[PDB]
Amino acid sequence: GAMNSSNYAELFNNDIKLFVDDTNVYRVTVHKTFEGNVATKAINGCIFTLNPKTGHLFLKIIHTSVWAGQKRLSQLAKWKTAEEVSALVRSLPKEEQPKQIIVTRKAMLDPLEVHMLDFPNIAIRPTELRLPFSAAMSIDKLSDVVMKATEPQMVLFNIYDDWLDRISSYTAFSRLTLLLRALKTNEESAKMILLSDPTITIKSYHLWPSFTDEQWITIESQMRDLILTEYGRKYNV
């Protein structure tokens, strides 16, 4: 059934599973037309498919040409997401295929179930967690590859960089969700925290800065402050 605070440690056991987040698949800007009506212009999107144990991210870039001539794009986006996830699974060797796929939005359940009918033993699950994966496009390197794409493309990343050399996947996921929650609540502040000190750089093959253990504790504490603050700035407390 649904994934929640109670069964949270299941994410870090040895059953292969993937989170799928579709919130950045169909992206638009809204603008005025010369006649003063409103129109949308699509921009490139991405499916965010993440193994929370290993950090492997399958970033399927959605080029705006896929929407050309199509109607009801928000509905189509869910089915396109399920089509691409199903194609990813079929592309993986049997021993790499997931045993569960957890969708971050319940509207993905039926599209993914229908696309995965060939895989009756892969469980499709919702979650009660309010995960911040929409903020993935606030990670500069991910946003850059999505916006530069001229055609459909899949790009592989490790969203944990090398953290698993020193910390557990439970702890790595907690750091990831804290960073992303911060970036979602106040992107400018979060990004200032991460890059303030110019002596700490991002390796070419990494997404985040090369913090020491002690610096991650400081960083993590600065993100928590940010989140509580904005939670006041928002609710006045």
Binding site: L76, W79, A82, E83, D110, P111, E113, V114, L117, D118
Partner: protein, 300 residues
Amino acid sequence: MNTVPFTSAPIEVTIGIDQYSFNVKENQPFHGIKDIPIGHVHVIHFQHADNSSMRYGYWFDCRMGNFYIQYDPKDGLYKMMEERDGAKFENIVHNFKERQMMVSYPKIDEDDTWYNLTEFVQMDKIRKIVRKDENQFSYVDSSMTTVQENELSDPAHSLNYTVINFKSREAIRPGHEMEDFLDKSYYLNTVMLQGIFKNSSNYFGELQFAFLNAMFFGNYGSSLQWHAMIELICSSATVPKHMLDKLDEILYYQIKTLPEQYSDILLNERVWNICLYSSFQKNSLHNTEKIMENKYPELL
């Protein structure tokens, strides 16, 4: 007109015959039902006075044999049986009529209700759904499960209806996933109508039989089947016009006949609101929508 005699009525029971019913007291001198219209299937059904649990009954067609009812004190129920000695049967019936020990099938001349509820229901199809090939009549009761319910336990006592499942490979063509899930026309017209049912008459007959088993026996799996068969049509964008017109009539008479007090358990809010107000056919069931809005506006 045909007759179903009763050997006797040893236990107090409410007897149904089609949409009619009457009470018989313990050891009351009751010897059956006469004037049963030829040309239709019929159902004779029972609810004991002591155990309202298990409604049960028998689908039959008097053109197929001479049938009678006899209580079995070991199995504790009224059983339908066939009399092969046609002379013994005519003699029995004539004696019971002369002694006026039979109730008359109480059909009003104007009244087409039973025809309208059984228009497409055939005894040959009912016997394939309910298997006991040695009898020409078919037993059904409140507890019997469907093949589909069993997949999700005795197969001899099952209802063999066609299994309808919108999230199944049978329903969804590879590469048409979104198309086939949001518009079920493929599944209705090619899978269910042409390769399984064979024509819309077999389809409607199974849909009518499922409703009648839900209404008369409270058979839950039959109710599931009835709603699935409605929803498959309403969720198809491409339906033959004659089928939509006939469905509106079928459902109108079903809703008309439903006991006002059982609508809470026999009508699925989600299916009906979807079918009448969201589906491709939301504007195609005028008679059904009108009676539903005037009889059960709460459900909607």
